[PDB]
């Protein structure tokens, strides 16, 4: 009686939302970008080859100085790389080898990681003893850790295999805010430039926009035919791309709340692993299971170029804050830099 | 020659780090990684107790071999999103409770719990991530199983089994049913063993099944097989 009433009402609200979205779809992004000149054939070459890992690499993140970067591999060690000289700065032994995510703090003072242990470990790099140590262990997730990103030296956002996402206070070590609503495992998240909003993708083929201060879902996005793995905010903070097992990247707009462009090719028979944007946002770089990475024109949706040189699936990607280089990681235990 | 005084010391630090990463890798390649699986009440507790958050790590040494067991039975998340992390383990230990032939799954609308364990075994065996990894099947609760079969026939689980309710025949039929799930018999082998709460001969069986796997993998790498 009341259950079916709530269900029909829900579907009525959803039809109303779909109609409201359609009402604003007067034109496609392709029609607007028709007059813009193409990007042309992109060319990038391997400038640095970083070795030292011995297992599958799963995560990597650039530092704010565009010179330092942290890499995570299931061999049990995190490595801080000097991308210019290739000299290792630190080697952090992991208490749990099965990590799948890593973050460099904006201040460069702390590093985070986690995985199947359901714990996010914070490592301090500026200890007076001259060695890295664990600052705090954030526990409370009922599932493997999927992604983590620093808001500040004391606040960090996290996502786990459990549908819940949480905002953590490092000083106290408790969840300041919890986010729920996903019907599937959350795989990745992306913080906005202003650090006031962030999006998260899950295996339910949906993406949700969250408010850090309030904690409510403001917008829900759909359109993917399979699990969403990667997600990245557009440099301006008004759009984000998502990568899926379906082999189709899609661009979503927040203000319009609709999909604007889809990036896919008939020869791509594999899913997406990582997504990133250039400093200008004109280039959309995505990692693919097929031992390569395609560069897509965000405006024209043309695959301008391809990056190759890995012997196994590309696990992670990252562009520097200055846009002078692009790092790539793969299960072959090698990390490379293009330019 | 073109480096400063401080830049020639960072190189030494990086070369000393590269020297400790390889020494640990050479220490992790001489160890046996064992993935542990099992359904509810599958006797996995007794197995781990006799042999010795999310992933649970248990380490032990038997006859100069260092083993590391990885219990993932507590991970309630999507298996296809983290099972690939264990690609390359030496072997997989699968625990099944024989007494489940008359116990329904948590969702009583579904098939028997033994059929659920069989489906899980089929899913984890015929997986693209473990086509080359062998499996070790421990059939738990044999003692109690021998008792219930006298009270409840085995046909409750297998309505097409035309045999006898004796312990030996029922156990052999269950073993055959579980072994027949191997769709890649030309590359994967299954080592079945019967265990109870009082038996302590499981670690030796694991040792033998791991030496056999190591021997066969060495022979295959050389291109002889």
């Amino acid at each position: 009686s009341e259950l079916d009433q709530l269900r029909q009402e829900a579907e009525q609200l959803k039809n109303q939302i779909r109609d409201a979205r359609k009402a604003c779809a007067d034109a496609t992004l392709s029609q607007i970008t028709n007059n813009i000149d193409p990007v042309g054939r992109i060319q990038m070459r391997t400038r640095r080859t970083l070795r030292g890992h011995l297992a599958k690499i799963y995560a990597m993140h650039w530092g704010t100085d565009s010179r330092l970067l942290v890499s995570a591999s299931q061999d049990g060690k995190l490595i801080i790389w000097d991308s210019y000289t290739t000299n290792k700065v630190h080697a952090i032994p992991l208490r749990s080898s099965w990590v799948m995510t890593c973050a460099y703090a904006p201040s460069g003072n702390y590093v985070a990681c986690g995985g199947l242990d359901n714990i996010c470990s914070i490592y301090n790099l500026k200890t007076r003893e001259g060695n890295v140590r664990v600052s705090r262990e954030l526990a409370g997730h009922t599932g493997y850790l999927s992604c983590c990103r620093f808001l500040d030296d004391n606040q960090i956002v996290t996502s786990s295999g459990d549908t819940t996402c949480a905002l953590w206070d490092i000083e106290t070590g408790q969840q300041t805010t919890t986010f729920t609503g996903h019907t599937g495992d959350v795989m990745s998240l992306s913080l906005a430039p202003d650090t006031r909003l962030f999006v998260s993708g899950a295996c339910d083929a949906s993406a949700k926009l969250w408010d850090v201060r309030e904690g409510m879902c403001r917008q829900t996005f759909t359109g993917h035919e399979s699990d969403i793995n990667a997600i990245c905010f557009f440099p301006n903070g008004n759009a984000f791309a998502t990568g899926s097992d379906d082999a189709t990247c899609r661009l979503f707009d927040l203000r319009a709340d609709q999909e604007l462009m889809t990036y896919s090719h008939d020869n791509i028979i594999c899913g997406i692993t990582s997504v990133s944007f250039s400093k200008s946002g004109r280039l959309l770089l995505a990692g693919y299971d097929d031992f390569n990475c395609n560069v897509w024109d965000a405006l024209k949706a043309d695959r301008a170029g391809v990056l190759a040189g890995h012997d196994n699936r590309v696990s992670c990607l990252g562009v520097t804050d200055d846009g002078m280089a692009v790092a790539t990681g793969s299960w072959d235990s090698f990390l490379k830099i293009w330019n | 020659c073109t480096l400063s005084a401080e830049d020639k010391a960072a190189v030494e630090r990086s070369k000393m780090i590269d020297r400790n990463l390889r020494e640990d890798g050479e220490k992790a390649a001489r160890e046996v990684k064992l993935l542990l699986l099992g359904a509810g009440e599958s006797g996995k507790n007794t197995i781990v107790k006799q042999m010795k958050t999310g992933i649970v790590e248990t380490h032990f040494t038997f006859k100069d071999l260092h083993f590391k067991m990885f219990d993932v039975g507590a991970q309630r998340s999507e298996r296809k999103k983290w099972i690939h992390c264990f690609e390359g383990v030496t072997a997989i230990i699968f625990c099944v409770a024989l007494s489940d032939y008359d116990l329904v799954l948590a969702e009583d609308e579904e098939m028997n719990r033994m059929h659920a364990s069989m489906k899980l075994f089929d899913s984890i065996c015929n997986n693209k991530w473990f086509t080359d990894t062998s499996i070790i099947l421990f059939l738990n609760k044999k003692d109690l199983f021998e008792e219930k079969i006298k009270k409840s026939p085995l046909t409750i689980c297998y309505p097409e089994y035309a045999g006898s309710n004796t312990y030996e025949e029922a156990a052999a039929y269950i073993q055959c049913q579980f072994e027949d799930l191997n769709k890649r018999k030309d590359t994967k082998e299954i080592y079945t063993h019967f265990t109870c709460s009082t038996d302590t001969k499981n670690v030796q069986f694991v040792f033998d099944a791991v030496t056999d796997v190591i021997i066969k993998n060495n022979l295959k790498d050389c291109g002889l097989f």
Partner: single-chain antibody
Amino acid sequence: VQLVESGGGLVQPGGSRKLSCSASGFAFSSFGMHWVRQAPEKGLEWVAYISSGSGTIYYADTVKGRFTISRDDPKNTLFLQMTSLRSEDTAMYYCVRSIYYYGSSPFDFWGQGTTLTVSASADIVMTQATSSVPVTPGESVSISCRSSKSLLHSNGNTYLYWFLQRPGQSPQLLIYRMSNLASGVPDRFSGSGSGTAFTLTISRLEAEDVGVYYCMQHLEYPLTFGAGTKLEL
């Protein structure tokens, strides 16, 4: 973090003596160690250096062959053997830790040092612009120094260091690489340079800012210290 030097004492001319230092409160094996001695007259001079791992050692042309440096990482101890002691060897020897990685601050911690008494070149010369500067608390002070060679390396870093040895205390790192302020130092201290001439500014002179300021170049070995600028109250 603490360094305790020991082994000093009176020695005959041409004798031998072995100094020892023990580290605590930090990873001794990760830091490189230096020996710096202060003659009876205020002034510093580099003696020797041993890298992390005992893979690189350097000595000064004034003691090389006569002195020897060694370390014991399993016990976090440092040693300095001496032979054919000259009359000029009388000085208070200090132990200094130094770790070299991107963003590190070498010479960050100085020990108390021990005193030793003896019974009766393309080196980059660093010259400070003033030996003593009378100043009272409240106003700013600008110390200056000059280098006989361009310390600005092609990598972009200017290997200039500033130290402050308060009366009866050990030197303290103020600024490293001519642009980075050391940890624990207040914002009163700042520095700049054009490549050959450098300056150290101290705003709002407090009561714990008097003493001899020593400049040091780290472009290459040997390490050369300045003549010292004593801010007297």
